[PDB]
Structure 1
């Protein structure tokens, strides 16, 4: 019943942040009292539900040894009016009594939702009482208050003030490493065959949270029980010998229904420069833009330079703009946030451009970061653009993006990267200094880049040694990344179909002659030769010339040069 840091899994950076925030003031009250420092009063943790936030608070309180208290919002609101106030006051008084103490208010938004949302007088009364109690913390002794909420705007804005729940931690969603941590923690009390590799399961289970992974483990265990227990009446020996296998985990993952599939995921991408070879100049430019101002700030301070806020990509579709953005994010170990074009189109259609504020807020909260806008031309393209209607190039969502970029302090090290297949119809108001100000052309991959792409695509496939990706890349000139990925997928499909047909034929052979090895253990190169028959060039020389014309037109004005000091 007493939890510790070991049990807490999924979140490590956030746990360290909370530790540095809370443990030191609690474990050394004299230090903060002696020093002229303001200890934290209210810490607001938000994230999707089921991430073990209450467990995090319990673990922190136990490890720090501070008295812990829990307040469930629905429980408080269940009481009759007047009794809810008594419960809240009693909770805070008890927390004060056993100072140092930590008060956790689970489901805070249920207590103090959006101000307009509350209708009756009792809701406003209890919210005001909570606010009054929060500001009466200085007279107390090291009584930190922690609260859980889905989103920062999901509570009454009055709470997010100084002396109130000002400090923030974003538990968010566990990443692959965090997911593996959670899976290892939950499977601590189960028998698992050597066949299973929890690392692979953690990799596969994208979009899940801690509760979802716990449900998956329970489902796998019960699937094993059903497969084996049904054979028995009941025998305890079977349960003792019960051991789940990777088939059970895969089937359970089939019936998963994760609750965080639609959330926004921020995490250092696993993509690396090797995944897309070539483009050394673009690599250097992205380095100078994103790495130097985080690995060498003193240089910028000494020489008095202002780091560029962001950059804009532009080139043929499916050439690896997202690949390059993710690679540069990986290089600096900075979180990567992608905003696909459909999100911008949804904001435009719903006239809900105000959501652009939340995107930049989330990017700031996870600094350093690389905010990626996959298609800035989507909204403009939706109106024609090249000719379009009689309106100008300005719109709602792009205007909000411009506002947020202008209101972004460069000291936070958040770099905006934009991508577009139609650079012309991009709003000229976003290409000025102080905004996206450098244009990087992402050409079609050359021979070496194509070899690297082909090698990266097949990294997860069983490929025979007889293949020669060098020759295949040499033959395919002008193919984009999408085309090469399509070629690899077609070869894989041919291999799978051949394997299945051979297996069925072998089954029939056994049926007729019921008296082995895999007929196609790996992708033979004849599959690739057959697959190449279905290859296509998504981009055309017309598009290539269009982009080269755009680049040359940008280049014309640079004629000033050959300067010479006397």
Structure 2
């Protein structure tokens, strides 16, 4: 029972399902697969940030399928003297072959077989070649699947990614909010958590935490509770049964967290929805046609012989919900959403690291269906002045990757730019972000929806009329409405703290309760609106509306009558 199983592993349901489909048939029905005569998977390379329980996934698969599991640790193999490591590898593969079907897990593969450049000693190259020889010799070995864990696909010798070798690849990646919740539930099974804790809240608050990080967080909360109990006070269990961790402990652990994957590229289905940004019905329809249709009805496109549009380009005033729209469409199709902010493109430009663009697209290719979002495609263009041409290394690499990505994969590039003019024209050609969608300032309905979405997490007095606030906030971008909501919240918090200080001081001076401000009231929003600013002047919307009017005026040639 203590052995690992699919229940013990969480946060990678999709990848775990992929591994299941890859390895169940060759392992559950070895002789049947041999009789079929079809090539089974031979090398499965799980990669992702460390601490995501890759070895846990391998052990769970082996245990659930009953296949003999052999663990090879990269550091363990390398620690042995020259020649001894080769003997260890040969013995490991031989033992795995003996107890076929079996799984050989080479944990920390990059420790054994890094990039050829990184390897310096002769024995390092020799052991890498020994591993390659064994992988090629798997052909004569029956029902032996080799699984390897490495931080990134480019962290190991490319010779290991050939065919007959670690060809199958799986990106475990950091878990999402739902995955984090699953991990927390898995690691909080034995802990008798108090009723106060809602693991969903922490799962939302634990952004950037790998599975190991969440396990450490749960351990830290347990140790906080145990510290409190010991301070209150071979060991009886009734106290442990009665020992309950509370949201105080979990928040304290959250404070002392140090997530290990804060800088990892987040790939997940966004929680945003169309209701979060009302209106934009035409843009919603266009986004649906571009994303949902090719991913939900490939048959229609095949029947009518069209290639789905590779991407679209949003243009409009800043902070009008371009990111909101991209996330909403990604959520509509339940497609992974990858956002590349303007700082990322600028970092690639300054460091001359445009090659990283390829990685980005690879990531998206690994998460298909996906919605690749470029937050500010014009960031590089702006950084260059706003006396060369429009071409630049980073956008050129983006073009190269966009051209060279198969349309069978449902990766859709949504570009966002506040300056449609300065964007490199080469990106707007057919086969690229051909379509240009104008995201204007929110209208009254969109303003109401934005205000409602912003105030979703705030206790707001029912007296406030968000309809009125949206009504006379004409010309306010989504960012401006968010700022108004945040400032009203700030005023409410300041009033709450001031009232609490007054209450405690009164108790001090009058030793001798109720919440003075349990909700954000109308006066708070009025004071906030006394600080409201229109981040977009009439002239900027003039520019955007006029560009749209130009693109529409030339879109004439109507009046067509076929007969």
Please state if 1:245 is matched with 2:246: yes
Greater alpha carbon shift after TM alignment, 370-379 vs 1-10: 1-10
Show CA shifts across 1:516-560 (max 9, x none): 211111111111111110000000001011111211222232221
CA distance in 2, matches of 1:184, 1:444: 42
Name the structure 2 match of 1:467. 464
Conserved? CA contact 2:192–2:241, under 8 Å: no
- Sort the Cα spacing of 1:212 and 1:304 in 2 relative to 1 into closer, same or farther, 3 A: same
Root-mean-square deviation over aligned CA pairs: 1.4
Tell me if the contact between 1:454 and 1:469 (Cα under 8 Å) persists in the aligned partners: yes
Q: In the alignment, what sits opposite 2:200?
A: 199
* Cα drift, residue 233 of structure 1: 15
Q: 1:84-104 deviations in whole A, cap 9, x for unaligned?
A: 110000000000111111100
Residue 511 of structure 1: which of 499, 508, 511 is its match?
508
The Cα shift of 1:323 comes to 0.3
Q: For residues 187 and 234 of structure 1, do their structure 2 counterparts lie closer, same or farther at Cα, with a shift above 3 Å needed?
A: closer
| CA 112–508 in structure 1, closer or farther in 2 if over 3 Å, else same | same
- Number of paired residues? 562
In the TM superposition, what is the alpha-carbon distance from 1:199 to its structure 2 partner? Answer: 1.6
Tell me what 1:370 maps to.
371
8 Å Cα contact 2:47/2:172 also seen in 1: yes
Q: How far has the Cα of 1:497 moved from its partner?
A: 0.6
Question: CA–CA distance in 1 between the matches of 2:292 and 2:57?
Answer: 33
C-alpha separation between the residues in 2 aligned to 1:383 and 1:92? 56
What's the TM-score once normalised by structure 2's chain length?
0.98
- Residue aligned with 1:416, SS: strand
On the 8 A contact 1:137/1:143 being kept in 2, the answer is yes
Cα distance, 1:367 vs structure 2:
0.5
Partner of residue 360, structure 2: 359
Distance 2:242 2:130 in 1: 57
Pick which of 432-441 and 2-11 moved more.
2-11
Hey, what does 1:104 align to over in structure 2?
A: 105
CA contact (8 A) 1:229 1:238 kept: no
Paired residues of 2:20 and 2:61 also in contact (CA < 8 A): yes
Runs ≥4 in structure 1, deviation > 6 angstroms? 233-237
SS in 2 for 1:183: helix
Deviation for aligned residue 1:235: 9.6
**Is the contact made by 1:44 and 1:169 (CA closer than 8 Å) also made in structure 2?**
yes
SS at match of 1:146: strand
In structure 1, stretches of 5+ residues that fail to align are none
Return the alpha-carbon distance in structure 1 between the equivalents of residues 438 and 110 of structure 2. 47
Give how far 1:49 is off: 0.3
1:402 to 392, 399, 402: 399
Report how far residue 294 of structure 1 moved.
1.3
- Conservation of the 8 A alpha-carbon contact between 1:229 and 1:239: no
Deviation at 1:34, TM superposition (A): 2.2
Deviation track 1:387-436 (CA, whole Å, cap 9, x = no partner) reads xxx11111101111111111111111111000001111100111111111
Alignment of 1:273-422 (within 5 A): 273-385=274-386, 390-422=387-419
> How many Å separate the matches in 2 of 1:187 and 1:237?
18
Matched residues in 2 for 1:513 and 1:142: separation?
A: 81
- CA separation of 1:182 and 1:233: change in aligned 2, threshold 3 A: closer
**Cα distance in 2, alignment partners of residues 94 and 29 from structure 1:** 17
**2:182 aligned with 1:181:** yes
Q: Evaluate the alpha carbon distance shift between residue 66 and residue 237 of structure 1 in structure 2; reply closer, same or farther with a 3 A threshold.
A: closer
For residue 237 of structure 1, report the CA deviation from its aligned partner: 7.0
- SS of 1:333's equivalent in the other structure is coil
- Aligned to 2:159, the other structure's residue is in SS state coil
CA distance in 1, matches of 2:397, 2:374: 13
Deviation at 1:198, TM superposition (A): 1.3
Tell me the secondary structure at the aligned position of residue 260 of structure 2: coil
> Could you tell me whether the CA contact under 8 Å between 1:10 and 1:178 is conserved in 2?
yes
Residue aligning to 2:484: 487
How far the C-alpha of 1:31 sits from its partner, in A, is 2.5
Distance 1:479 1:116, change over 3 A: same
Worse-superposed segment, 74-83 or 546-555? 546-555
Q: Aligned equivalents of 1:35 and 1:421: distance in 2?
A: 57
Q: CA deviation at 1:295?
A: 1.4
Tell me the TM-score normalised to structure 1 length. 0.98
Deviation at 1:499, TM superposition (A): 0.5
Cα-to-partner distance string for 1:48-87 (whole Å, 9 max, x where unaligned): 0001111111111011011110000011001110101100
Deviation at 1:240, TM superposition (A): 5.2
Q: Is the 8 A contact 1:182 1:213 kept in 2?
A: yes
3-state DSSP class of the match of 2:532?
coil
**Shift in Å at residue 238 of structure 1?**
5.4
What SS class does the counterpart of residue 462 from structure 2 fall into? coil
Distance 1:234 1:139, change over 3 A: closer
Work out whether residues 317 and 536 of structure 2, in 8 Å CA contact, stay in contact via their aligned partners in 1. yes
Contact 1:311 1:436 survives alignment (8 Å): yes
- 8 Å CA contact 1:44–1:167 kept in 2: the answer is yes
